[PDB]
């Protein structure tokens, strides 16, 4: 019973670690997103000119 109990805990742990990693990983794309959005703003400024 002890062994099985512990096992389940490790499964829990790795689940959380995966989700955490995934979230922080996904957080980086916003960098590029911001870059390109701002770039479009500047482009529109030039068009206005």
């Amino acid at each position: 019973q002890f062994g099985s109990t512990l096992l389940s805990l490790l499964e829990r742990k790795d689940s959380l670690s995966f989700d955490a990693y995934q979230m922080i990983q996904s957080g980086d794309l916003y960098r590029f997103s911001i870059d390109l959005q701002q770039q479009d703003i500047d482009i529109n400024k030039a068009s206005l000119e």
Partner: protein
């Protein structure tokens, strides 16, 4: 006699015309006083 003969306009016309050209020369402008530079834009 409340009025006086004013300075006649053509004179100031001349003065101003030359002063305008002079100003353009002050700032390296066209005779039209337009910028001579291309005024490039970026960000």
């Amino acid at each position: 006699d409340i009025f006086m003969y004013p300075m006649n306009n053509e004179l100031r016309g001349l003065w101003d015309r030359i002063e305008n050209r002079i100003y353009n020369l002050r700032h390296n402008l066209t005779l039209d006083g337009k910028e001579i530079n291309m005024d490039l834009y970026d960000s």
